[PDB]
Structure formats: structure tokens, C-alpha cells
């Protein structure tokens, strides 16, 4: 039945299994979907969120290799607007966890979940606790 357009934005820095579980989840919200991933720009991220270690090109080249990803918007806008939804014909925005209030109010919000500990920072911890 109807193909549903899903939009998930993020930094997607040092992409780990937690990101991928999230993308798979968005991708499978409905039986027939197109998953659009948005990749935040270097400057906006570092100005609003924090340090990023991978460039925009690098963070986006990786997402191209993920099975669940159908389209990539890179760079994507930092805030999602109603115009943005209409331009890309987006039916739902998928993200963890108001700045999402207006999307919930419109019934266009689908919550997805983070997976803890599986991150690339916590992997060096493992390498490092080879040493007392």
C-alpha cells in the first residue's frame, strides 16, 4: 500500500550500532517507506551541539553504505520547518524523544530510540582497560 516518506535528521558522527538500530527503526515504521536521512552541517553542529570529529562529507559517505537509507539530504537544515516537509513531501519525522511539539501536534512525529554503550567512544574504553 501507500509509500510513506520518513525523515530522520542527525549528526551521525562516528556512526555506531545505536545509530543504525535507529535508522532501521525509522525505515520500518511502515510496510512501504522511503527513509530520508538529514545530515547536519559542520558549523551548525559545532555551534549548537558540540564537537564533531568527522566532516560532513565523511559522515555522509558512511550513511550511503547503510541498508536502510534511501535518500540523504546533506547538509540538512538545523531546524525542521513545515515548508521543509512540503518540499520533500515528508509524511513523518523520526527522531529520539519541545521543538518536536509542533510535529506531534500535526501527527507527523514518530519516536525512535537510542541504544546505550554501543558507541565508538565506549569502544576505546574497552581497548584501554587492557591496562590497569
Ligand X SMILES: O=C(O)c1ccncc1
Q: Which residues bind its own copies (CB under 8 A)?
A: 14, 17, 20, 23-24, 51, 53-54, 58, 61-62, 64-69, 118, 120, 123-124, 126-127, 130
Pairing of strands 33-40, 109-112: unpaired
Q: Which listed option, its own copies, ligand X, none, makes contact with residue 35 (CB within 5 to 8 Å by class)?
A: none
Residue 13 within binding range of ligand X, rule CB under 6 A: no
Residues contributing to the annotated binding site for CMP: 11-12, 19, 96, 115
Instruction: Report the nearest approach of its own copies to the CB of residue 99 (Å).
Output: 28
* Angstrom distance (rounded) from CA 10 to CA 74: 10
| Exposure string over 80-105, b if 16+ CB within 10 A, otherwise e | beeebbeebebbbbbbeeeeeeebee
Residue of 34, 36, 38 whose CA lies nearest to 12: 38
The partner in contact with residue 10, picked from ligand X, its own copies, none with C-beta cut-offs of 5 to 8 angstroms by kind, is ligand X
How near is the Cβ of 79 to its own copies at its closest, in Å?
28
Q: How far apart are CA 107 and CA 86, in angstroms?
A: 15
Strand partners, 94: 110
10 binding ligand X? (CB under 6 A): yes
Toward ligand X, which CB reaches closer, 25 or 40?
40
Q: Look up residue 103 and give its three cell numbers.
A: 510535529
Residue nearest to ligand X (CB): 9
Q: Which residues of the shown chain bind ligand X in the complex (CB under 6 A)?
A: 9-11, 40, 78
Amino acid at each position: 500500500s501507500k509509500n510513506v516518506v520518513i525523515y530522520a535528521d542527525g549528526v551521525y558522527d562516528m556512526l555506531h550500532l545505536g545509530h543504525m538500530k535507529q535508522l532501521e527503526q525509522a525505515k520500518k515504521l511502515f510496510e512501504n517507506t522511503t527513509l530520508i536521512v538529514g545530515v547536519t552541517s559542520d558549523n551548525e553542529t559545532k555551534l549548537f551541539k558540540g564537537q564533531v570529529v568527522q566532516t560532513l562529507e565523511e559522515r555522509t559517505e558512511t550513511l550511503k553504505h547503510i541498508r536502510w537509507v534511501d535518500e540523504i539530504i546533506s547538509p540538512c537544515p538545523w531546524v525542521v520547518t513545515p515548508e521543509f516537509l512540503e518540499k520533500y513531501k515528508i509524511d513523518y519525522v523520526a527522531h529520539d524523544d519541545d521543538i518536536y511539539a509542533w510535529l506531534k501536534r500535526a501527527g507527523k512525529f514518530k519516536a525512535t530510540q537510542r541504544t546505550e554503550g554501543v558507541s565508538t567512544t565506549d569502544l576505546i574504553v574497552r581497548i584501554l582497560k587492557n591496562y590497569e
